[PDB]
């Protein structure tokens, strides 16, 4: 699963929310958060699209978008407010074990970068979504309703942080809807010096190795060497 | 399979018994065949073919390890033992080969008369 | 009077790097799972008693 700022359709922890980092005091390192229970997210593109074919050469066709029938509305995702509040409370409780009993922990949105990094980017049934998660990370913690994230759609895609190979995604016909589980986070910390009693965490991501490091973290590969020599008191006849 | 990794040496001595994916499969098959053949040949050149515990004719040099038989088979694991005698493995391996060649020559000499 | 004895099948292992292949549960998909080996229905797992190993999440090959 390729996504940023949010791990989807993965595995869950078994006892508590897990916080992992290479060096937790180095703020240049990403923090990986593994959830205990998943958070449902509903994403939809509600336009009824149309596809047309244009012959650009002998045996070559280009699939363009025709006319949307009906009204034109914005694509969006929905998350539950209470479940997100509970999950953030648990994450804060487990994060305080590395920063102390009495530190103020606040969540603020991302800051700077390209659209892939500053937004929750994913792919729902052919279409590529980039959603604004400024309502997910906006709070401060001191020791029925829904949250709607508006999303944009892009058709020319640059993957794997490469330059020189773009890809065009042909249109998908009809309304699009999907349901996913949020099961983790990728976070970063700000370098607050000069006797800072508060810590600020911002969503991160962009490198896909951290996505599959959250699945291959309990595995290692070893080589078997089933041949040994030892001393005894017995001799070959 | 690897179930006696944490037991003593003596306890463990009783229980010794194209495309992206298509290219990766073939290398694994070749590696498995290579490893099996190498182990079988190494066992064979020592005269130990067809056995899981094989008695040799090479005396143990006390400079390899000076411990008694009580703190080897009742106090260590094979992973601990492998860390001690890792520097002397090739010496013993050459000694075994020379010893087996001498045995072959002696058997030929016995059949000669 | 001690002699060398050879044991074939001892439980020793070392850290290594190798090529892992793919197995998938038994057509046009980006990751060609149709070219992968079928999966065993009930895989075998062996618990290793009295064994402590060292893992590193951030240097996995």
């Amino acid at each position, epitope marked *: 699963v390729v996504s940023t700022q949010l791990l989807l359709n993965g595995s869950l922890a078994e006892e508590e929310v897990m916080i992992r980092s290479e060096n937790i005091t180095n703020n240049a390192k990403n923090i990986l958060v593994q959830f205990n229970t998943p958070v449902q997210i509903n994403c939809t593109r509600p336009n009824n699209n149309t596809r047309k074919s244009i012959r650009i050469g002998p045996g070559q066709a280009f699939y363009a978008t025709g006319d949307i029938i009906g009204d034109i509305r914005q694509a969006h995702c929905n998350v539950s407010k209470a479940t997100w509040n509970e999950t953030l409370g648990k994450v804060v409780k487990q994060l305080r074990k590395h920063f102390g009993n009495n530190t103020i922990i606040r969540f603020a949105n991302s800051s700077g970068g390209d659209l892939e990094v500053t937004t929750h980017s994913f792919n729902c049934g052919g279409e590529f979504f980039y959603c604004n998660t400024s309502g997910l990370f906006n709070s401060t913690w001191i020791s029925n309703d829904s949250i709607t994230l508006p999303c944009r759609i892009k058709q020319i895609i640059n993957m794997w942080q490469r330059i020189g190979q773009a890809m065009y995604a042909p249109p998908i016909q009809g309304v699009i809807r999907c349901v996913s589980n949020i099961t983790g986070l990728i976070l970063t910390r700000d370098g607050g010096s000069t006797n800072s009693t508060t810590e600020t965490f911002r969503p991160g991501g962009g490198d896909m190795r951290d996505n599959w490091r959250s699945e291959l973290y309990k595995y290692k590969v070893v080589k078997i060497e089933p041949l040994g020599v030892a001393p*005894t008191r017995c001799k070959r006849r | 399979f690897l179930g006696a990794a944490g037991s003593t040496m003596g*306890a463990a*001595s*009783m229980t010794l018994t194209l495309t992206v994916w298509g290219i990766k499969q073939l290398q694994a098959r070749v590696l498995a065949v290579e490893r099996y053949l190498r182990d079988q040949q190494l066992l064979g050149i020592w005269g130990c073919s067809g056995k899981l515990i094989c008695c040799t004719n090479v005396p143990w040099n006390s400079s390899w390890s000076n411990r008694n038989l*009580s*703190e080897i088979w*009742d106090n260590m694991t094979w992973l601990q033992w492998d860390k001690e005698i890792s520097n002397y493995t090739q010496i013993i391996y050459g000694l075994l080969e020379e010893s087996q060649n001498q045995q072959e020559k002696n058997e030929q000499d016995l059949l000669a008369l | 009077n001690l002699w060398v004895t050879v044991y074939y099948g001892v439980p020793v292992w070392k850290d290594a790097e190798t090529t892992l292949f793919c197995a998938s549960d038994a057509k046009h998909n980006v990751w060609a799972t149709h070219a992968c080996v079928p999966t065993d229905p009930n895989p075998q797992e062996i618990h290793l008693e009295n064994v402590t190993e060292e893992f590193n999440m951030w240097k996995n090959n």
Partner: antibody
Amino acid sequence: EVQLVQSGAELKKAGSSVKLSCQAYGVAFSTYSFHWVRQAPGQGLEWLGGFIPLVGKPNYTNKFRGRLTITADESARTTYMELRSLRSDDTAIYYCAGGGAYSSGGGRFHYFGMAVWGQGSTVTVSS
Amino acid sequence: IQLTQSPSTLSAPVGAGVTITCQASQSISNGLAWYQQKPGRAPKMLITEGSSLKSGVPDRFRGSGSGTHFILTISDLQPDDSATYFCQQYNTFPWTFGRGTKVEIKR
């Protein structure tokens, strides 16, 4: 640490049978060696029988041939000693002991003695 | 195989060294062990393989010998050492014990 736990005291009559159990903790049961040793009041130690669960063939002294049986339950990690046709001289304290062994291949097993002992069970044969 | 222990009883002061001799009817190589038993308690193994000391045993106990003669030496006698010492052979079945040597502290 390896620990052996035995059953409680027993009173029996002459001609009856007695069964004692010994449960092992902290070792792989199948590859360990278990032995039974009895002590009469005011006397020395006597070896009755020894047995490795994996091999499964107990070894007995000739004085107790036909009256002594040593069995093992691997799932319960227990070993049982059964003595039959009890006599007045069979009143004693019975200990269950354990020790490690190793193999050099070809039916050869070498031992180190009994390193772990149980607390003992008192068996009294009287009317 | 019969194991003969000498002496049957022994009394010595604290800090003194005592010697117990175990003799085998036939050779048993190194398969001899020394056990100590206190009244009302299970035996505790002191020496294995004739001369190898068990873990946790004080160094004042030493074992020696081979063939058919073995020796157990207690160099620094202590009041805690009053007990019965046994030699046991485990080289050949059936395993046999000695008749025991009683060591008493003289004060």
